[PDB]
């Protein structure tokens, strides 16, 4: 049944995890009580990818909610679909992680991970065929970042032949909790390079820009940022949740999207960001604009190794291909020439809530290096003076471990750059 286990960890993880389930429950007809009230059976043909069947024939998300403090966890339970979640599947502690990677990964989080894995194992064991795991988390805090990557390391140990997928929100000074966010995120990136197969870079800088230059919002809230994440996450999982000509799954996605096993960091894109549906030429133009990227890199700076785009609504399959093949042969300077058919398209007849035409795009571009460069700069600026390190060495970490993470990420930037000129 190719089931997926979903894990949300920390403030950002559980906030943008909640919306995800709010969005796709609506798309699948499941109300805040877990009862299905839908018109089409397209809503139910692949509903076991993300939902467990209940005793009352209800649907319960295959979702594990994880935090080191219960602040955001109680707020999820009181939000719209809060009672949808299996109550045994809220796993939390009380001390928090203080925006500290070491606390999440080595001390506070080490105390709580074993119980989370009991809920993974409970969910994993009741799965006919398990594709793998989907983690939602930020990288600049402590729980989602440090404890999140700890969970990833332990899941890879218990389940090494399953796929590990993350939605990974990147920190940015424009939406900044603390000055130590580059430390937390450099450390987390080293984990993700090694221990995931596919990671969606959701950059909070791009999300703030799209909110402020484009959607005409002069002070955007986290709720506006997350509405963009909600739509991206729905579209990027459409081919998993809905029956298509494409039997998309997490392993096929990785095989076709990742040519080299460390370059698995995808740039999402969405359109549109109203009562006039867009024309297929507007979907295609907007999607591939730098202004519709959820990761804050100009794709005109590097090249697409691979791309996977999905168009949602009732539209001209021939015009999709017409317009797709158009923007390639208009901008073929920004795709690699040595991967035949590296741009793949699909269409789903079911559109997302309140949009007649939409289009989500997955991009494995080498311009993602600009994000890692940006993180790496902010990191060295502090670490050259060993500033703020006392928070980490107080939890047991050595300066050595930092130099290593810096090193592995600057390598990552090199590898991404070796293929930009290939």
């Amino acid at each position: 049944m190719r089931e997926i286990v979903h894990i949300q960890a920390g403030q950002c993880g559980n906030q943008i995890g909640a919306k995800f389930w709010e969005v796709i429950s609506d798309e699948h007809g499941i109300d805040p009580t877990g009862s299905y009230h839908g018109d089409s059976d397209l809503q139910l043909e692949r509903i076991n990818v993300y939902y467990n069947e209940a005793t009352g024939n209800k649907y319960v998300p295959r979702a594990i909610l994880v935090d080191l403090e219960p602040g955001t966890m109680d707020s999820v339970r009181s939000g719209p679909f809060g009672q949808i979640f299996r109550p045994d599947n809220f796993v939390f502690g009380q001390s928090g992680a203080g925006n500290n990677w070491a606390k999440g990964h080595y001390t506070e989080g080490a105390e709580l991970v074993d119980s989370v894995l009991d809920v993974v194992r409970k969910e994993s064991e009741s799965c006919d065929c398990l594709q793998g795991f989907q983690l939602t988390h930020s990288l600049g805090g402590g729980t989602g970042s440090g404890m999140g990557t700890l969970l990833i390391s332990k899941i890879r140990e218990e389940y090494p032949d399953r796929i590990m997928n993350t939605f990974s929100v990147m920190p940015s000074p424009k939406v900044s909790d603390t000055v130590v966010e580059p430390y937390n995120a450099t450390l987390s990136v080293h984990q993700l390079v090694e221990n995931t197969d596919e990671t969606y870079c959701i950059d909070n800088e791009a999300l703030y820009d799209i909110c402020f230059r484009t959607l005409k919002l002069t002070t955007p809230t986290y709720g506006d940022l997350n509405h963009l994440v909600s739509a991206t996450m729905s579209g990027v999982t459409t081919c998993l949740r809905f029956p298509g000509q494409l039997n998309a799954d997490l392993r096929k996605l990785a095989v076709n999207m990742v040519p080299f096993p460390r370059l698995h960091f995808f740039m999402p894109g969405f359109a549109p960001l109203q009562y006039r549906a867009l024309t297929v030429p507007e979907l295609t133009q907007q999607m591939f604009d730098s202004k519709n990227m959820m990761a804050a890199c100009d794709p005109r700076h590097g090249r697409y190794l691979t791309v996977a785009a999905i168009f949602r609504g009732r539209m001209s399959m021939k015009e999709v291909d017409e317009q797709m093949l158009n923007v390639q042969n208009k901008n073929s300077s920004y795709f690699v020439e040595w991967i035949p058919n590296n741009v793949k398209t699909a269409v789903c007849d079911i559109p997302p809530r309140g949009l007649k035409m939409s289009a989500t795009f997955i991009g494995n571009s080498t311009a993602i290096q600009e994000l890692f460069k940006r993180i790496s700069e902010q990191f060295t600026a502090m670490f050259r003076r060993k500033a703020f390190l006392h928070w980490y060495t107080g939890e047991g970490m050595d300066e050595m471990e930092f130099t290593e993470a810096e090193s592995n990420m600057n390598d990552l930037v090199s590898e991404y750059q070796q293929y930009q000129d290939a």
Partner: protein, 317 residues
């Protein structure tokens, strides 16, 4: 907006078609190996025709005709004229194909004045047969340009488009060995820019060894009381017509998944009874200098932009 690659860099003619295409603001050049092109200016050798026309949504066009070597390799040109029934033919010299086919046996059946030519010039079969490559008769009695007692050949430029319309370029060129003509001393016998750009006083009785069509018309009127159209060009058009109509079903890209156009260089000799002779067919010709501008534009007009439209100087045959 259209797409094209370039894969013969040192081609005098398509270096200029490629430059003119960029300067229309509607054509984007690519790397030699980008498969997402509309137009290919391919290699002179081993152009991979097997790979064209397999790009979804891409109309592809190429500046060569797969199989046009049947006409441009002198071994196969004779084999074509001898074997193809559309060619029986009284404008191609008596010719034989010998190997270091082949027909040395019949090569002597017609040997009772027999002076001949071989390359790829003497009177005795032994002299050149030691070059261990085609053997023709030598035009012992050519037409002479006066005053000067000169030899020359005609180069005609023929464009075939994707529809197989046969376009003769209005302008041609006379290329003389501008030295008097002798007998038997191997200077004016090979008359061009290969035993006259190193050995053989480089352009005496005219300009750059090149006498263009208006000048040569004027001489024919004054010297012979005939015209270029009547005495020569009719036979030239007949010869161009016959070869290309002969291989038309072997190379036509009319119902193919890609399409072809190609520029040819036909080379002729005129004898002293005003009879026109075919020498060889050039598959990658270089143009004459002052005409590059006007020919390299008509290519775009009828061979390129005719397939990929944007926002006469040829004789149709």
């Amino acid at each position: 907006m259209y797409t094209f690659v370039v894969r013969d860099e040192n081609s005098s003619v398509y270096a200029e078609v490629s430059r003119l295409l960029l300067a229309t603001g509607q054509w984007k050049r690519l790397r030699k190996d980008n498969p997402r092109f509309n137009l290919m200016l391919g290699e002179r050798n081993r152009l991979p025709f097997g790979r064209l026309g397999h790009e979804p949504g891409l109309v592809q066009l190429v500046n060569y005709y797969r199989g046009a070597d049947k006409l441009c390799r002198k071994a196969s040109l004779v084999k074509l004229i001898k074997t193809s029934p559309e060619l029986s033919c009284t404008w191609f010299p008596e010719s034989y194909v010998i190997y270091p086919t082949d027909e040395r046996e019949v090569f002597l059946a017609a040997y009772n004045g027999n002076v001949w030519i071989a390359k790829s010039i003497s009177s005795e079969a032994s002299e050149l047969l030691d070059f261990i490559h085609v053997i023709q008769k030598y035009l012992e009695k050519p037409l002479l340009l006066e005053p000067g007692h000169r030899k020359f050949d005609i180069r005609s430029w023929v464009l075939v488009d994707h529809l197989y319309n046969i376009y003769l370029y209005r302008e041609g060129v006379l290329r003389t060995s501008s030295e008097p003509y002798n007998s038997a001393d191997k200077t004016c016998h090979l008359t061009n820019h290969c035993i006259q750009k190193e050995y053989s006083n480089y352009g005496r009785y005219e300009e750059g060894n090149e006498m263009f069509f208006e000048e040569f018309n004027q001489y024919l009127m004054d010297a012979l009381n005939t015209t270029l159209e009547n005495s020569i060009l009719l036979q030239i058009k007949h010869i161009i017509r016959s070869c290309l109509m002969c291989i038309e079903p072997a190379i036509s890209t009319k119902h193919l998944h890609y399409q072809s156009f190609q520029l040819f260089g036909f080379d002729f000799m005129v004898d002293e009874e005003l009879k026109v002779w075919l020498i060889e067919v050039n598959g990658a010709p270089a143009c004459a200098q002052k005409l590059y501008a006007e020919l390299c534009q008509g290519i775009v007009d009828v061979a390129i932009s005719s397939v990929f439209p944007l926002a006469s100087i040829f004789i149709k045959l």
